[PDB]
Amino acid sequence: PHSMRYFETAVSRPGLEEPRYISVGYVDNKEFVRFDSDAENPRYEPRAPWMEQEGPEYWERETQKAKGQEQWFRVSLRNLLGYYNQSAGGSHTLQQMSGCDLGSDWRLLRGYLQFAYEGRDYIALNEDLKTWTAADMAAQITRRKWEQSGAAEHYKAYLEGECVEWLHRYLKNGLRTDSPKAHVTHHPRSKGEVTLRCWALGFYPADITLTWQLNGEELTQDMELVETRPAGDGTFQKWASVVVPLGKEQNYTCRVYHEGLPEPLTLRW
């Protein structure tokens, strides 16, 4: 029940043979370190209070690692450019999601290593941590190369050692919840139609479900709803709306499901 991920982006930029490289670390989906090559002195930086106890050796080893990753992604971008026979004056994107899950028995639960090129899946390590899945024939070049070099075994060694070790260390510090405050607003829409908007504000985590019923029956089909969005103050907002006949508003109920709620909230106009 615990996770560490690294999300990496490399962006090849027209002009200057150096592409931009960003790396973001997360523990339990909370961002805890960040590296960005666009800084004056690019270096990994703490993003969680509990990372300020590490000390300079940690930061310099990790920064050196990210400067290596910057060179690795630069070369991989050039390789891929060649595989697809693309031009060199463009901007191109390589992405990376990787890391581990730590189970209740303190063992490696699952490992992850997948890449995307231009926002599309390219190659991923399979659950067995032994084989690769390639999206197209260019990714099959890369997959032949990584089978040749035994890449999966080396990464499995990282997963079973350094990854779960540092995840455990981080967990030995870095667990909060905030129920939504919900209300229904009313908006004249068409001539004899109105919009009921069901709002959920001020909740954490961001996972939530808003539903509209007409005397118990779910209206999911003809329901408009916006992506959950950050208030910018730690909490989140969402709304779902339906269009109803003017005068019938009281036959419609909104139902809000959220972790911190002792029971799902039900609301009306």
Partner: antibody, heavy 116, light 108 residues
Framework: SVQLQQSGAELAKPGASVKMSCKAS????????MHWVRQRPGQGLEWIGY????????EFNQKFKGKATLTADKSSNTAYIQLTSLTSDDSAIYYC?????????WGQGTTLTVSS | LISMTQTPSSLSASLGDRVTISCRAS??????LNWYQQKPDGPVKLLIY???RLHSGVPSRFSGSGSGTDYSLTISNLEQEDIATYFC?????????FGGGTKLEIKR
């Protein structure tokens, strides 16, 4: 015109794990929760948990926390339940079912037998 | 977890009868009460949701009623295809919970 097609009968050794699938057709897969329900031979229905395929979010009946893992593949419109450390207690029928506080539509069920 | 009790586990009826199956929750569930039918062979279908609402497809001889902590399903004219097992389920507080059973059988 909603259909939930579940994968076929499983059978597995004690201590292994299984993955069973439920493919959703006829409706937008990510707009409804998928629930999982267990019935042991001769027993009633027990609720396992649900997954919200939009986000991958999962919630469980506390007794299945260390037993079941729920996942969704929206490119293929398919939910999955994985059970680990199988014992003879896990032999049962497993259904997937759509919606939120009621279960609109049920898969046909996947039978799992745990035997050496 | 909210406890759903049905009584009994077996009900005997004859074809043409008005069968009633009852469900009792350990606390008030605000009509978020649903009824499923499991046929002897396997398939499970929703019959009644939200105490009294007939799911589409379900013949109108199925009716649902109740409030607070007591709920009931009635079939007004028991047909052969109605000989099945019937489950109640509360949708009020997590975890969702089912009643135990009530299986129907012909009288002879």
């Amino acid at each position: 015109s909603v259909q939930l097609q579940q994968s076929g009968a499983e059978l597995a050794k004690p201590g292994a794990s299984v993955k069973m699938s439920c493919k959703a057709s006829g409706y937008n897969f990510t707009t409804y929760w998928m629930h999982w329900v267990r019935q042991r031979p001769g027993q009633g229905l027990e609720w396992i948990g649900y997954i919200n395929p939009s986000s991958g979010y999962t919630e469980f009946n506390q007794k299945f926390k260390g037993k079941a893992t729920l996942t969704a593949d929206k490119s293929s419109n398919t939910a999955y339940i994985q059970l680990t450390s199988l014992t003879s207690d896990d032999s049962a029928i497993y259904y997937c079912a759509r919606s939120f506080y009621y279960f609109d539509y049920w898969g046909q069920g996947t039978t799992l037998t745990v035997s050496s | 977890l909210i406890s759903m009790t049905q009584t009994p586990s077996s009900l005997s009826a004859s074809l043409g009868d008005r069968v009633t199956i009852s469900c009792r929750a350990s606390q008030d569930i605000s009509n978020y009460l649903n009824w499923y039918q499991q046929k002897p062979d396997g398939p499970v279908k929703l019959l009644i949701y939200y105490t009294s609402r007939l799911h589409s497809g379900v013949p109108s001889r199925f009716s649902g009623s109740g409030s607070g902590t007591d709920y009931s399903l009635t079939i007004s004219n028991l047909e052969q295809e109605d000989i099945a097992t019937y489950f109640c389920q509360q949708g009020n507080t997590f975890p969702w919970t089912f009643g135990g059973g009530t299986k129907l059988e012909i009288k002879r």
